[PDB]
Design an enzyme around this catalytic site. Sequence first.
Site, PDB file in Angstrom:
ATOM      1  N   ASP A 287       0.829  -1.196   0.000  1.00  0.00           N
ATOM      2  CA  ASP A 287       0.000   0.000   0.000  1.00  0.00           C
ATOM      3  C   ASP A 287       0.877   1.266   0.000  1.00  0.00           C
ATOM      4  O   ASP A 287       1.897   1.344   0.724  1.00  0.00           O
ATOM      5  CB  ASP A 287      -0.863  -0.002   1.279  1.00  0.00           C
ATOM      6  CG  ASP A 287      -2.000   1.012   1.236  1.00  0.00           C
ATOM      7  OD1 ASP A 287      -2.886   0.892   0.362  1.00  0.00           O
ATOM      8  OD2 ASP A 287      -2.025   1.921   2.089  1.00  0.00           O
TER       9      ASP A 287
ATOM     10  N   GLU B 222       0.997  -0.471  -5.146  1.00  0.00           N
ATOM     11  CA  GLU B 222       0.155   0.669  -5.431  1.00  0.00           C
ATOM     12  C   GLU B 222       1.021   1.873  -5.194  1.00  0.00           C
ATOM     13  O   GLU B 222       1.524   2.058  -4.112  1.00  0.00           O
ATOM     14  CB  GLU B 222      -1.085   0.724  -4.553  1.00  0.00           C
ATOM     15  CG  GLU B 222      -1.850   2.056  -4.680  1.00  0.00           C
ATOM     16  CD  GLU B 222      -1.396   3.075  -3.686  1.00  0.00           C
ATOM     17  OE1 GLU B 222      -1.681   2.790  -2.507  1.00  0.00           O
ATOM     18  OE2 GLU B 222      -0.723   4.094  -4.051  1.00  0.00           O
TER      19      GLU B 222
END
Length: 755
Positions: free
Chosen positions: A430, A483
């Site tokens: 993330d 990401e």
Amino acid sequence: ISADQVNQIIYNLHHDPFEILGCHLLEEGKNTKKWVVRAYLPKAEAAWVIRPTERKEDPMNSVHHPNFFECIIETPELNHYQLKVKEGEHEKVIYDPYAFSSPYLTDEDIYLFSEGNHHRIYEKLGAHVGEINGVKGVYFAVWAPNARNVSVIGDFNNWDGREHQMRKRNYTIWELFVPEIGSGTVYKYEIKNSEGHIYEKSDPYGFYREVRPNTASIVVDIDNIYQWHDEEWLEKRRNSDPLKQPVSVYEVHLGSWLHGSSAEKMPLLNGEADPVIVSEWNPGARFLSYYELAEKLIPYVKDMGYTHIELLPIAEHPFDGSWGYQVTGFYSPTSRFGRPEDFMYFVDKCHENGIGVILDWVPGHFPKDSHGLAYFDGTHLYEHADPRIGEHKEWGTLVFNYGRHEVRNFLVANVLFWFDKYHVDGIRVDAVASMLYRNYLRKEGEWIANEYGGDEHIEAVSFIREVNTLLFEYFPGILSIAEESTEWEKVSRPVYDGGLGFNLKWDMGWMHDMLDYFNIDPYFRQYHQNNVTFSMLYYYNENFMLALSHDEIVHGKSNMLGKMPGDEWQKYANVRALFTYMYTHPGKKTMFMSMEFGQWSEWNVWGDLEWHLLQYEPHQQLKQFFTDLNALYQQEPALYTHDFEYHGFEWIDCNDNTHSVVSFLRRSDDPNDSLVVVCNFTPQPHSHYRIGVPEAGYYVELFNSDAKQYGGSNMGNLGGKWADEWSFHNKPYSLDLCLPPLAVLILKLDPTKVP
Ligand SMILES: OC[C@H]1O[C@H](O[C@H]2[C@H](O)[C@@H](O)[C@@H](O[C@H]3[C@H](O)[C@@H](O)[C@@H](O[C@H]4[C@H](O)[C@@H](O)[C@@H](O[C@H]5[C@H](O)[C@@H](O)[C@@H](O[C@H]6[C@H](O)[C@@H](O)[C@@H](O)O[C@@H]6CO)O[C@@H]5CO)O[C@@H]4CO)O[C@@H]3CO)O[C@@H]2CO)[C@H](O)[C@@H](O)[C@@H]1O
Ligand SMILES: OC[C@H]1O[C@H](O[C@H]2[C@H](O)[C@@H](O)[C@@H](O[C@H]3[C@H](O)[C@@H](O)[C@@H](O[C@H]4[C@H](O)[C@@H](O)[C@@H](O)O[C@@H]4CO)O[C@@H]3CO)O[C@@H]2CO)[C@H](O)[C@@H](O)[C@@H]1O
Ligand SMILES: OC[C@H]1O[C@H](O[C@H]2[C@H](O)[C@@H](O)[C@@H](O[C@H]3[C@H](O)[C@@H](O)[C@@H](O[C@H]4[C@H](O)[C@@H](O)[C@@H](O)O[C@@H]4CO)O[C@@H]3CO)O[C@@H]2CO)[C@H](O)[C@@H](O)[C@@H]1O
Ligand SMILES: OC[C@H]1O[C@H](O[C@H]2[C@H](O)[C@@H](O)[C@@H](O[C@H]3[C@H](O)[C@@H](O)[C@@H](O)O[C@@H]3CO)O[C@@H]2CO)[C@H](O)[C@@H](O)[C@@H]1O
Ligand SMILES: [Mg+2]
């Protein structure tokens, strides 16, 4: 070695196999040294020694006996190796069972740790069952350079640590052996710091923990709790290129997919345990265990036909509301859902069903909770001391000092830990931008540049490239997904080309373009045809994963049906259309639980999913649709084999924006595998819509999202259509199609068909 020595090993007469087996120095040269690795592998006919960080592999020769192997290597140091073992037609890769004589830390262990290159530090730091001075006990060890004293407190000594004061070694690590205790031991580290203050701390390298909100560590005999069965799976992974295979990920938060009754115990693998209540406000509800999940989630996922499950973080984290993203026990799977063996069981079973497991992994930051790593030894140990680089102020969390060796080692080894002890198949990270930028969520005067006056976080980039370099080296065939939301270049490209080394990147732009697009009334989509087509400009700069994730159905963004305009019928059609377009667009695929059966409520981490909807047609029809689409995904190589090469995709035509229509081909090795995909993104059907194709023949309707059994109106082409000798969109032949409303068609040439 002699045959007497070998036979002693073979016939179990040898007094200490560690003298003979494992790695042993033979002699030292000017530049380099001669080592031998020795192994006794019954039933193996062949074996190699892999030196994955050096990118080398050497064969072992049988010696005096077919299953006894020796292999001699020259290299200055030989700290990092595995054995490949061949048993008939299968091969496994494993660490050397004879690597470590003793449970305590050697000079070599410590030295390496201090460079930050001990890729198995989790074997020595933490708590480990072992024998010292002839007594079975537990070895405890912890990094805490600046502590003034440390001791071990726990069940075994009524939390008084005066008889259990630890010995400081090399001014850096505290150790203690404790006899007669073993696995199950509940414990923490009492630390007195520089200025006399005495906190209590969970084990950073602990392998299990009490159920939150409690934080004491528990001792685990991690190598003797579970028998695996996934040698075949691991071999197939190691030998394949996951980039050229179908990847459809079902994204899951374990604590919120399905709950059970707190009125009963939590079943584990051959065992049971007290229920873990989900909230004090929903006390009738309990979590399911890793064991129960293996029984329920896996067959659900297998049926749906997803190739992977991706978990939101499962490292021990203290607050359910973080979703997992705020971790305090990096080296233990959360006790919310049972024991380490139970998770081992889950993964074994995913593999038994040919489903891989991806783990959301959180190296970016950690919380100030005092049981955890924050200010560990009374200094800024794990986090950087400058808050301009060691805090994320808006989040209230701490940032690891990636430039500090022992800190880097903590994380690099941790990632390697999950692939090692839990056999996982990949990771997702993330919010990588939070690591990369020295000014992330900081404004002028509130952050300092790197040494060249850039915004780049040099230490973080180094670290990410180490992670990805080692991970692929030790475990090829895995997925490392990022990401990263800022146009940073080469995220999913190799480290040698100056990449960060992931092999997949979530295409956030795509996601935004697609959802913004579908959200718009159909009549007005003609002004936004570029949402559909834009992605493909930048597409080939990265290997993209097309994810519609958990983040997109929270915080009043609504669930997927909620985002769609029109009546209930159109709402569902928009979903089928979007998702069918997603499964045909180039890229791998990820979607989050509840999307696949049309949940109306946004995802709420405090309850479970609205499973009662599955008792009504529309939801079941949508779930069938996803089942068939996954099945098609897996059966149609044009949809996965060339995701990331030009050959795989070419537009037929994307200029009829007044009808919101676009059409394209997908390709594989075989030219007979080529697909024609036609999208119609409005409720207006079209009766004689001509599309150009590249060759004559019957084109079969492979899939049609408006099918009756998916909730559609059942318009379509009655199973296929004969192409015409009629040039269109610059192609010799062409098709005169019925385009159903809010629908997508997938057609394939059947060149063996009766004219
Ligand atoms: O994954 C979803 C699902 O999609 C596909 O199946 C669906 C299909 O796309 C959809 O259109 C429909 O098809 C069914 C249909 O409901 C049934 O009626 C049956 O169709 C037969 C039909 O009853 C017969 O009339 C006959 O069709 C003749 C026409 O009557 C002729 O006029 C002529 O058609 C021409 C037409 O008149 C002109 O306008 C011209 O421009 O183009 C036409 C060319 O065909 O010839 C046809 C050919 O015989 O025969 C039909 C076939 O038996 O069966 C249909 C197919 O199953 O619903 C389907 C299911 O929901 C996909 O194929 C599935 O695999 C997939 O599962
Ligand atoms: O009596 C012994 C000495 O004790 C004191 O020095 C301490 C530090 O206060 C400790 O915190 C510790 O620090 C280590 C650190 O753990 C380690 O990572 C490494 O740091 C590197 C860093 O990784 C690198 O990127 C770059 O910044 O250089 C750093 C320095 O090499 O090494 C640190 C220092 O060894 O270690 C010592 C020993 O406990 C005290 O201040 C001394 O005066 C005293 O002699
Ligand atoms: O064969 C008769 C008709 O065939 C074709 O109609 C199409 C529409 O053009 C499509 O848009 C779609 O209709 C959807 C409609 O878009 C949707 O809003 C919804 O409307 C229903 C409504 O739910 C229902 O309660 C009531 O209002 O009736 C409406 C139905 O007309 O659901 C529709 C699908 O059921 O699909 C139909 C059928 O393929 C054709 O274009 C028409 O000319 C023709 O009369
Ligand atoms: O039946 C006894 C008791 O056990 C359970 O609490 C244990 C916790 O797991 C654990 O936190 C630990 O408590 C120690 C703290 O960790 C420590 O930081 C310090 O403050 O001392 C504590 C022990 O005095 O162990 C306890 C005790 O076994 C359970 O949750 C209790 O409610 C239960 O009463
Ligand atoms: Mg519920």
